[PDB]
Amino acid sequence: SNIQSYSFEDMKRIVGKHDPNVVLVDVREPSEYSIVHIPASINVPYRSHPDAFALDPLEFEKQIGIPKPDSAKELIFYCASGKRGGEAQKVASSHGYSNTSLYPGSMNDWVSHGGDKLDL
Ligand SMILES: [Cl-]
To answer: Per its UniProt record, what Gene3D superfamilies does this chain match?
Structure first.
C-alpha cells in the first residue's frame, strides 16, 4: 500500500485525538524545532542523526536523548518542507517500523495554515 500521507486538516484531526499509539516525528534540527513545533511531537533530527531510526533502543537513547519510539505505533514523519521527513520515513520503514506515515507538507504547511496558533 501507498504510504499513508496526511494534509493539514488530517494533521489537525490527529493532533486533536491525542492518540497514545501515534508518534509525531519531527526530523528538523533542534534549532528549527525550538522555533516552533507540534505539541507532544518528538524531535529526531535527520541531518545530524540520519541513522537514528536504524539504532537499537539503548544506542538510540544515547544518541538522541529520548527513548526509541515503540515500533507498534504509527510514526508520522515530517520536517520543514518534507524531504528530510521522507528520508527518515524510509530509514524507519527499513528498520522494523511497519506502521509509518508522512505529513508531506511538514512544518511549512503547518505554519502556513496557522497550526502554531492552535491549542488542540
Ligand atoms: Cl513510543
So the answer is: Rhodanese-like domain (3.40.250.10)
